[PDB]
Symmetry: D3
Subunit: 309 residues, 6 copies
């Protein structure tokens, strides 16, 4: 979907930029924000057209509090702030954000330049509260050393999982995206053997093969994020996580970003991860990963995004 | 769309070939030309399949006069010859062309080879009247130094803008294309400051950012090529312009090519460019660019092309 | 089109892996085979996702006889074992095969790794009877030195030619695939002149141009594999042939693979090739190429494959 | 030069990592740091070998103070700490750093990974004092929008400019490097016209062509960084500058890094930049750029590095 | 040899530009020309640095008449105008040229931009008399359909063949380059069978294999351009020919360019091609190829080029 | 470094072809072999030149015994047939081979085509006894899942380790190469834990980091293949190992190839591996890998090879 905003279905990229901003309180601030996001195709082409391949994309997400400031009477069915979770030792905090820009390209400069134009257009009307520069790490691995994104649905299944349909016609083609910036305890994770790490995740480390049924822990990342309803129907999300870090501050991170037609699915995966199935049987990845942020956004389709204001 | 003729919606390429031809007067010339263009998928695949990536595309256009020679019975709603324009300072001539081949690939050799095969097959039945070898120039710029193509519609908008639909269902999937070969007066262009050039185009130069509303001159290229109907709906065209030139003949050019499901959109941009809006307030780009050609073609869909 | 099994319509790749297997007569064997192939998206993603470009693909084919062991209640309209041919000079053997894995990627390692994992997951439940490592050879050529695959249908044409439609609705989106592992007599082919070789194939060698109608032998590979029915309508297959070989065993092969919504088209092609049209007037390609295998498979759509 | 430490003459890369560290006071810290930097080819190959292309490079610099702790006996002729400069308007501070790792690759992940391994291995024996992740910006530009590196010497000139030779034969193959992290005042820079910016730099912006002699201001960046001795011989440095930034902290930067067989050349450029030539006639680039750091390191050859 | 002028030894490229110019008669004209060519590293880096790969190169050649206008007292041993040849049916004309720029890059825009800057710097001081935009054609083929450049010497042998040595110390590292723009009669060549074409050339068409000794005509392109002196020592040249053409004017061409430490070798190859060995036994490639130009230039080393003026 | 035979110092490639041949006992056979290998630059250029990047390379090795048939008068100091080994558990067989063709390129087709032409030109004069198609496997790994080739010497180090120097001046620029076609016991290797596998090799698996001195087994592949002499001086080989395999025959191999200025280094390595150091303390890699071949060749410099 060459240089069109709200391309939720783009395949993974070598570079990404995640920007989370909070909008100013004023009416001027609300109008500027609208002007910028509803015309986001402008900066997108202004930057992206300069690369022959046209790899640049930009998905705009809008938070529930900000949505109600600008579209009080028409609201997608499931738009609400991120639901925080507190387990006994691990928590998913709910942190501020009115705007998400999830920007991807084959090159860093393209992501940076678009972020630069976007921030410049907003000026005093919004403030950056989180900024993460994602990068591909070897053969699609995360900093834990496992291939990250394998079972993502693709093509038609990606459309089915991620994009609003007949259930909420007024917002068909939109999505719900959740972000969490995770920081890893690399030391503690390195004290585990590969075989233990594989039990935490649910897949072999180097070869990225799913552990067979009878060796697959009930509390593995894979088991707990498998969602089958009563009718036996599987429910998937579309993820685009990326490595990030700072060697001097000792930050080694995974930026989780996940898209769903109904955030209930993502919310339940999180509930299973943090609170367990059965209760207390939680995701051990969280012994090595601590979420510093948690924000939910509505991803309007292009048509709805262009109308804002 | 891999190796299919009439792929109007292909993205930009590193290389392109623009071939404009006039057909012979004889009934035999007509039949040769029709045999070649109707089976154009042959040469297209014969050359194109040789590249793993399959970047080669070929769009065939037919002029109004030639169309009448081969399909006197049914005509696309808007097919007519290019309309010359005489402005207060500059003019867009209408020049001959029965056939357009708009060829694009990742490599010069594929364009050249497809051109070679096509010309060879047409033999004496046609004559090359204009030929330009277009090339990507740095980060999608033209020789004026500005990023050229930025606001092209893409994907669905591109299809809505360029392809014939329900309004002329007999020729669904076709398009209308207009070409003009422009030559620039480079030294005159260089006497302008960058800011002056920016005001002429409507966008910042290096950074390719549209001037804000209150800094946008009323006669800027962008302003005059903005087409908004009475219901407030914008109407866009799809452009595939490329740089070309010859250093010995001091030729520095932009080959303009624009596709639209209704050429009146393109034509109205041209009128607003050459005559001005309001009249007299014409596009300053034309102070540094002179069109040496001007031709309109109908772009039949594959089905229609294949039956000519 | 990324990392989805049963993607028949994928473009040419630089590397290929063709695996043909026979299943165990057992019931655990039938079950292991079913678990592996119905969840083929697993290993495909497990390998493919490691490559940024996501070039890896995998079409699974099921032989007629093994299909019956696994879905007796329901069967595609035209599934059957490969019809062997015995003609004037040359013969097409019908050889054994229950499972086909047609694997393609931009890299060899991705092909091999996927293969490794499919083989490991089947364990004792199945046996490899034919393994071919296909490779791109220069500008899309076969080892006979001709560009191989040129007139393949593409895009919508390719879908219409290869994919089961309204005529068999329970299996919509599936296909029928025929493989044949050909080996060439290189020294004998090399005693031909280029012009003789062109006569055999139907196209010029370097330039890959189809011979003129008046110069085109009635027994050239091209004429014999051209299918026009009684209404004047053409019928096409989608092929993904690849070179392969071993230098010390002096094997130089074309691994033929072709997909159709209906095997009757491929089978007619094969008849015209081996039997001749008129009879005795057979495909001279067959004088320099000997089919060492011959097998038909049904390619289930992704839905049909996942429930099995 | 594939995967060899101290490859000063590597061409520009898409990505780089600049790590500046201070070592611990203890004798044990000294020994750990020396063990790590002397065996730096280990991590370099451990990461670098994983990329087919082998683009990864790593240049280790050592500060004057730390050098004295480990090789009290022999010193490179010109090793001393960075000299602060106080100009009439702007100043270049001298900031701490015992170790420099200048890491370059085609991919961020290789830089980051090499950095990770190096920091891990140094443990408590050192602290990261500055870290910047540099990146190529369009067609070799810096964030001021100018092509940055144009006149770098290359090949033999590069080796003559950057590498220690007969003048200090004990440290042949070494170099001296100076780093300064500059932050820009982007909005101030943008109040200038393109022509003004061109006069500040000494080159046209889009086209990267040096201003002719009579249009070149006496205080242009290019003019002040031209070093010609009394015999008329120019003395050049080798720069590997990269863009960096943070959009949230409104940081837009150029990380300057310059290698020379004699840092007095670099230092004299700095003096002429910060104090002016004649005094007071300083580099206007410094009106829009502020150096947050300033540090000098000796770059030992592989032999010397390996014996530390 | 990244972005350095006079890089004679560069491997073949996807695009090339050959520019041949004649210098104006005046002293101002001579000085401008000198200023431009002696500072040619300026435009080279100005353009070439913008491509990360640094593929751009520029070799400057100077004709004998122009050399004597500017360096009257120091002259390379073998610098003279191109020696014309007239066979009974085919001739190698000697055509004007004081300056050659042989420019190569991985992209057209880079060649074009450098040519543009070079021509701009010369203004009225010189006139373009020939301009050819070369391009790679498939797998290193020429428009005759044969792989063109196969037997070129490489690495050390390339240096030995192409570059002035101890024989002429004052100009060590310089070269002598000859150009001829050939246009083909494609029709007449297409009337030959592949096997005949192979006999003309000396190599198989598709596979590019040298014809064995006993099937190799005495008048093949390969036989006639094989140069063995009396001592049995082989003498090679370094060629960088490229396809070019214009579909509308029906031009299909090969731009021959060949470098040698002593143009005597190139001259003898030409003499053999045009006049035959034995006499009359000429190169049949010339039945299908007609030279429209013929010019010889001296290629100074970087040091000598920088000194001019 | 382009298209010159006997280029030992070439970096890793995506594809590989290893050909080992035995010569005919005849005199025509000896002569045909000599014509083909002394003019090996012919076919190398014939194939290589077709690829813009010029990645194709070809090292020719001559076995000790065939060398004697062809240049009895003159012999390299350390030429001899492969010394076989019989150790506590595992044995390295000395197998037949007169000619080695070590071929590398960015593409398979280039490898195969070069091979095809070398084989065709030798005809009946020689016979292929071992053919291996090597491939790059993910991030420079072998099929044991470890990064293979990491500590290879590079640039000047690589030249000093691999190329005959002042110590044998008549053969300066030549090398000695040992090949061994290893096959792996995959299921047995997979019963090991990652940490056990790391103990066997000497390096961490995913991260490819060399184990700390205190954690490093005395029988790890790394320690056993580390050569330090009595003066404290290290001696290294240059390896170009590649993966290879066949799925249906369940072969999963590492094709070992190593070059040295002196085979004594490689031979010591092989002794420490098979016999153990102290004796019995052998390379555990050998528990999961079995050498199916074992052959030494002299790699003549280009001069020496061309006169033969
Ligand atoms: C530190 C943060 C995380 C890390 C390192 C991580 C890592 C991984 C890895 C290595 C896999 C296996 C390959 C694959 O993607 O299929 C995986 C799977 C998955 N993860 Fe995460 N993940 C993280 C956070 C999350 C969160 C917060 C969620 C849910 C909101 C989530 C949902 C999933 C899902 C749905 C799968 C696919 C499971 C399946 O059906 O096989 N992940 N993750
Ligand atoms: C000398 C020939 C021309 C040059 C050098 C030129 C250059 C440019 C440039 C630099 C832009 C801004 C970037 C972009 O959005 O593409 C532009 C925009 C545009 N031009 Fe042209 N142009 C030329 C002729 C024409 C002609 C003849 C037409 C109409 C027939 C045309 C129609 C347009 C349109 C529709 C836009 C997009 C306006 C918008 O909606 O923002 N151009 N052109
Ligand atoms: C804010 C930091 C700086 C910026 C943005 C900057 C930018 C530039 C630009 C655009 C050029 C022209 C292109 C080129 O030839 O590279 C240039 C040239 C140059 N700069 Fe800088 N520069 C910076 C700092 C420095 C410093 C600190 C030094 C010396 C220590 C320096 C030394 C040079 C030199 C030697 C040249 C080439 C001059 C010539 O011979 O033409 N620069 N710089
Ligand atoms: C229409 C013009 C020409 C064409 C089409 C042409 C074509 C070819 C071809 C296809 C080859 C075989 C591959 C190879 O390069 O090794 C070749 C070889 C060669 N050509 Fe040309 N050539 C042309 C002009 C010239 C001229 C004018 C000269 C001499 C001044 C020349 C000198 C050579 C040489 C030295 C070889 C290598 C012979 C050997 O040692 O094998 N060529 N040429
Ligand atoms: Cl960024
Ligand atoms: Cl062209
Ligand atoms: Cl494979
Ligand atoms: Cl980094
Ligand atoms: Cl050009
Ligand atoms: Cl091979």
């Amino acid at each position: 979907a060459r240089l069109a905003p709200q391309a939720v279905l783009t395949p993974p990229s070598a570079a990404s930029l995640f920007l989370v901003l909070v909008a100013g309180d004023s009416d001027d601030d609300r109008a500027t924000v609208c002007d910028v996001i509803s015309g986001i195709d402008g900066p997108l082409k202004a930057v992206g057209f300069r690369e022959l391949a046209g790899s640049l994309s930009c998905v705009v997400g809008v938070g529930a509090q900000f949505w109600d400031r600008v579209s009080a009477s028409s609201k997608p069915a499931h738009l609400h702030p991120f639901v925080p979770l507190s387990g006994p030792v691990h928590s998913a905090p709910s942190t501020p954000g009115d705007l998400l820009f999830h920007i991807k390209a084959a090159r860093k400069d393209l992501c940076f330049e678009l972020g630069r134009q976007i921030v410049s257009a907003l000026g005093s009307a919004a403030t950056v509260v989180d900024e993460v520069h994602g990068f591909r790490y070897f053969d699609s691995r995360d900093l834990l050393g496992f291939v990250d994104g394998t079972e993502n649905p693709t093509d038609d299944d990606a459309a089915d999982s991620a994009l609003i349909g007949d259930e909420d016609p007024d917002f068909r083609g939109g999505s719900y995206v959740i972000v969490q910036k995770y920081l890893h305890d690399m030391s503690a994770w390195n004290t585990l053997s590969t075989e233990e790490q594989e039990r935490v995740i649910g897949r072999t480390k180097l070869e990225n093969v799913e552990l067979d049924d009878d060796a697959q822990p009930s509390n593995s990342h894979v088991t707990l994020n498998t969602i089958v309803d009563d009718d036996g129907v599987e429910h998937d999300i579309l993820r685009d996580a990326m490595a990030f870090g700072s060697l001097g501050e000792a930050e080694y991170g995974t930026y989780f970003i996940g898209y769903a037609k109904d955030p209930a699915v993502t919310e339940l995966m999180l509930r299973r991860m943090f609170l367990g199935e059965p209760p207390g049987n939680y995701d051990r990845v969280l012994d090595f990963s601590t979420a510093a942020t948690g924000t939910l956004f509505f991803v309007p389709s292009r048509d709805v995004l262009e109308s804002l204001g």
